[PDB]
Amino acid sequence: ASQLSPTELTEMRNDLFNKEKARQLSLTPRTEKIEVKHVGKTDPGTVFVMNKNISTPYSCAMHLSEWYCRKSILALVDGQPWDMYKPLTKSCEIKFLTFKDCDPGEVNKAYWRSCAMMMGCVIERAFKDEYMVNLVRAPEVPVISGAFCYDVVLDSKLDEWMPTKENLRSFTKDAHALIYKDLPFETLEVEAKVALEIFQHSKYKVDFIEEKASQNPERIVKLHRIGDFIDVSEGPLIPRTSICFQYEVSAVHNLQPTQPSLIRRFQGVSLPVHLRAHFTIWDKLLERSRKMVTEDQ
Amino acid sequence: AAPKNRRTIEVNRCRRRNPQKLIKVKNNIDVCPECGHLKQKHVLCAYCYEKVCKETAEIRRQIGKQEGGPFKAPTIETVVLYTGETPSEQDQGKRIIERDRKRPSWFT
Amino acid sequence: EGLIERTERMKKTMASQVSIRRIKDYDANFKIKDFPEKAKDIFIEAHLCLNNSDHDRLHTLVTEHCFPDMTWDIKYKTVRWSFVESLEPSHVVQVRCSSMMNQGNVYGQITVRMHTRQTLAIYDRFGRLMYGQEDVPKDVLEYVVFEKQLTNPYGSWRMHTKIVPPWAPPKQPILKTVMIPGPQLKPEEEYE
Amino acid sequence: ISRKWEKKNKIVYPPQLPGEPRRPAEIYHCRRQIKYSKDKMWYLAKLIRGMSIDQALAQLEFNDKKGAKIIKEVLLEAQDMAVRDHNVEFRSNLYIAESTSGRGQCLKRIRYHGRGRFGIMEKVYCHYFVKLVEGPPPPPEPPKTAVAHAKEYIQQLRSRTIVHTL
Ligand SMILES: [Zn+2]
């Protein structure tokens, strides 16, 4: 830990991320073939001959049809939800999950994780430079609650203020500007040592990486990026950042008595393009999302 | 009444190439959740309807074979059965029609 | 070191020798040892004329059996083939002939094994690389046969076919993904 | 009779230098002598003109016109031959660049008007021409804004000279 400008911190973080991605692309010498089967319901028996650690379930959807690319939000690699731009590794079986499936719980969780990550990206780059803004983590609140949340610790000078409606609308406008540019949710699986060396600064992120690499015997934590923002998240994410259609930030709340310092919780609600609600229903959801949600035990 | 002058290709293009005479783009089209064969909202899927119609045609052919001739219309309910599928206790008084098939996994 | 039951090996040698004897009886002044060089050069220059797309010479160099086998799947693509080195001198591995009477024609077929390296790079109709690599002399082990019409008064020695045993190593992969569709069902049920 | 659209797939390009744009694939297809009017076919071709392959097939599947299924069939064979012959990996990665109809060879028949008078009936035929380019459909040109209008007006004002003098 030393003195570093946030801009140079982002540049060095991106450089390390790209170097790791390059070495992951490079340790495989030649193009290898995988026979990924389609265990879905609409196009059964379809096998794709894809490239190892190069091609993606979005590429499989491109082979199938354009509707698959448009509607498929998650993949299922033999048991598990994969984000749409994660290169495939072994000869597997695949199934595409959309927002209107019978059991869309996995895609709901992934969509809310993505929305929380976008909200954190908007928050980190919307405050004065001489305040220290640090992201603690995004609690894995359930969709049945009113909103997704992000925990942020601000510098000591801002332990007495509260953002007003204009500032909240500014946060929503930043979120919509982020939505307007189609940014893929790039993914990466790295080792614990590399994960620590990318961040190297925030003790909150350090303990987050420790907690996320302890339960894995291989000490691997997932890493995701939109544009030049990099966050640590649990579980996969949605392919594109324009999937969200309605996006807002509702309010921010404090939880002081659990720590000498102050941790704020930003809350927000979003609805995808496939599931847009009417003006009145969206107003109802907006009004509910302003309530504090406490699901951490 | 006869045309006093020939219509020019410019006038004709303006008349027959304006947006009122063009085909409109429709946004009612989405994928069928079953069979994924590109149905249209507010309209039944052609693939699924054809499947159901084929099964109904086979059942009706069996009905005609069992009924004998015209003007029969049995005064009891009816039930369709398949390979195995012993009749149930509630469908005693019903006519039984079992052609020969494994029951499709949409007709229960 | 020689293996057991060399009597059958010598019997195969004698069958090849009697085929050579029939070839010599039809046509004398035909040495045996200089053939592998001729076959190697014919192979090399036939593939060179394939790269240059010269069918009038490829016809004189290869037979009508393997003309379409070698020219059809490559009609609208560009090939970059180049023989670089002969690893070991080729060996004549089989010499057979048939006494076919259907048209009073006897054909001599000789299989010669060659191990060598070459550079193959097949481009697309639009100029995009498809299969091979430019300058990586990958090694190939190939058994190619040559057929001649003995009864013909001219009878150019041309290549006939190429044999591939199932144990042969798999060739290099394809640079593009491929989708193999399953059964295209009418209203029906899928059983697999 | 001219058949030049058929021979546009026989063009072979020299291999590209490594450091060059992808040069997307270019597939031409057509159907000749369709028992349909060429204006009626032009309307469907005009609708299909700018869409991607999947969107065009979707639009043609729910059009109740005789030529809609014909154009759908032509597009399906074009897609199949694009993937099979012209080295297009993604079957959905095609868009329609050119889609037009042309007059075919017709026949003439007698109409038997309501006296010893008559007319000549023409048995209409037409061709359909399609061209698919590999890649996503190009974005539509956005309408020009008031900023662009003002900019071009200012440039028009600034471009003017003193005419008919030195
Ligand atoms: Zn259906």
UniProtKB/Swiss-Prot annotation, chain A:
Start and end residues of each TGS domain: 32-98
Record's subcellular location: Mitochondrion
Tissue specificity comment: Isoform 1 is ubiquitously expressed. Isoform 2 is heart-specific.
Main location: mitochondrion
Keywords: Acetylation, Leigh syndrome, Mitochondrion, Primary mitochondrial disease, Ribonucleoprotein, Ribosomal protein
Any Gene Ontology biological process: mitochondrial translation
Effect of G268V: In COXPD59; uncertain significance
GO CC aspect terms: mitochondrial inner membrane; mitochondrial large ribosomal subunit; mitochondrial ribosome; mitochondrion
Pathology linked to this chain's protein: Combined oxidative phosphorylation deficiency 59: An autosomal recessive mitochondrial disease presenting with multisystem manifestations of variable severity. The disease spectrum ranges from lethal infantile Leigh syndrome to a milder disorder characterized by hypertrophic cardiomyopathy, lactic acidosis, attention deficit-hyperactivity disorder, and survival into adulthood.
Family: Belongs to the mitochondrion-specific ribosomal protein mL39 family.
Protein name: Large ribosomal subunit protein mL39
Origin species: Homo sapiens (Human)
Swiss-Prot record, chain B:
Keyword Mitochondrion: yes
Segments of this protein annotated with the region Disordered: 86-108
Record carries keyword Mitochondrion: yes
GO biological process: mitochondrial translation; translation
GO cellular component labels: mitochondrial inner membrane; mitochondrial large ribosomal subunit; mitochondrial matrix; mitochondrial ribosome; mitochondrion
Residues reported to bind Zn(2+): C32, C35, C45, C48
Keyword annotations: Mitochondrion, Ribonucleoprotein, Ribosomal protein, Transit peptide
Location of the protein in the cell: Mitochondrion
Highest taxon in the source lineage: Eukaryota
Basic and acidic residues bias spans: 91-103
Post-translational modification note: MRPL32 precursor is processed by the m-AAA protease (composed of AFG3L2 and SPG7), which cleaves the N-terminal transit peptide. Cleavage by the m-AAA protease takes place prior to assembly into the large subunit, an essential step for mitochondrial ribosome (mitoribosome) assembly. Proper processing by the m-AAA protease is dependent on the zinc-binding region within the tightly folded C-terminal domain of MRPL32: zinc-dependent folding halts degradation initiated from the N-terminus and triggers the release of mature MRPL32.
Example GO molecular function: RNA binding
Function (record text): Component of the mitochondrial large ribosomal subunit (mt-LSU). The mitochondrial ribosome (mitoribosome) is a large ribonucleoprotein complex responsible for the synthesis of proteins inside mitochondria.
Similarity annotation: Belongs to the bacterial ribosomal protein bL32 family.
Quaternary context: Component of the mitochondrial large ribosomal subunit (mt-LSU). Mature mammalian 55S mitochondrial ribosomes consist of a small (28S) and a large (39S) subunit. The 28S small subunit contains a 12S ribosomal RNA (12S mt-rRNA) and 30 different proteins. The 39S large subunit contains a 16S rRNA (16S mt-rRNA), a copy of mitochondrial valine transfer RNA (mt-tRNA(Val)), which plays an integral structural role, and 52 different proteins. bL32m has a zinc binding site.
Name recorded for this polypeptide: Large ribosomal subunit protein bL32m
Record organism: Homo sapiens
Upper lineage: Eukaryota, Metazoa, Chordata, Craniata, Vertebrata
Curated annotation (Swiss-Prot), chain C:
Description of how the protein assembles with itself and partners: Component of the mitochondrial large ribosomal subunit (mt-LSU). Mature mammalian 55S mitochondrial ribosomes consist of a small (28S) and a large (39S) subunit. The 28S small subunit contains a 12S ribosomal RNA (12S mt-rRNA) and 30 different proteins. The 39S large subunit contains a 16S rRNA (16S mt-rRNA), a copy of mitochondrial valine transfer RNA (mt-tRNA(Val)), which plays an integral structural role, and 52 different proteins.
Biological processes, Gene Ontology terms: mitochondrial translation
One GO location term (cellular component): mitochondrial inner membrane
Molecular-function GO terms, alphabetical: RNA binding; structural constituent of ribosome
The organism's place on the tree of life at top rank: Eukaryota
Coiled coil: none
Keyword Ribonucleoprotein: yes
Task performed by this protein: Component of the mitochondrial large ribosomal subunit (mt-LSU). Within the mitochondrial ribosomes, required to direct the nascent polypeptide toward the tunnel exit and position the exit at a distance from the membrane surface.
Residues of the full protein shown: 103 to 294 of 306
Protein name in UniProt: Large ribosomal subunit protein mL45
